[PDB]
Amino acid sequence: KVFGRCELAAAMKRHGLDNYRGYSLGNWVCAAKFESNFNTQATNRNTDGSTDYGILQINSRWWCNDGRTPGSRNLCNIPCSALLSSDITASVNCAKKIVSDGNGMNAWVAWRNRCKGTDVQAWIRGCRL
Ligand SMILES: [Cl-]
Ligand SMILES: [Cl-]
Numbered sequence: 349k350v351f352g353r354c355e356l357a358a359a360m361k362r363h364g365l366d367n368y369r370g371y372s373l374g375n376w377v378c379a380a381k382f383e384s385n386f387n388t389q390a391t392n393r394n395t396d397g398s399t400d401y402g403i404l405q406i407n408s409r410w411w412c413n414d415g416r417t418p419g420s421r422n423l424c425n426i427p428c429s430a431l432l433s434s435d436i437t438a439s440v441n442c443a444k445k446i447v448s449d450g451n452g453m454n455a456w457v458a459w460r461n462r463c464k465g466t467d468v469q470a471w472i473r474g475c476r477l
């Protein structure tokens with residue numbers, strides 16, 4: 349599923365991400381935009397052999413099991429493939445654990461390089477929610 353901008357904001361809000369750990373909704377929508385272009389099916393291989401999965405490109409190195417990332421952890425206790433559903437629940441629940449872990453949303457490279465310090469409220473402008 350490829351979410352619309354306001355559609356995803358609403359879905360994320362419903363799942364409790366608005367101001368989660370102090371991060372406004374615009375931050376999460378921005379991160380999703382640049383991580384996956386709002387596409388729940390997005391997968392991307394990393395150089396170390398891990399893979400990033402789904403709307404928020406969650407990494408098999410730490411957070412999910414794909415059975416092909418030697419030495420990795422599965423800290424969200426989920427198969428990585430469950431992070432590719434049209435329903436974002438699994439991705440959101442795992443994201444809440446990631447953002448609570450120490451360095452906040454800096455864990456998302458695209459957020460740090462493209463969203464952090466920007467006018468993130470623009471991502472939810474005109475959205476019902
Ligand atoms: Cl679609
Ligand atoms: Cl915002």
Ligand SMILES: [Cl-]
Pocket residue numbers: 359434435436437
């Ligand atoms: Cl959803």
Ligand code: NA
Pocket residue numbers: 413414415416417418419420
């Ligand atoms: Na593995």
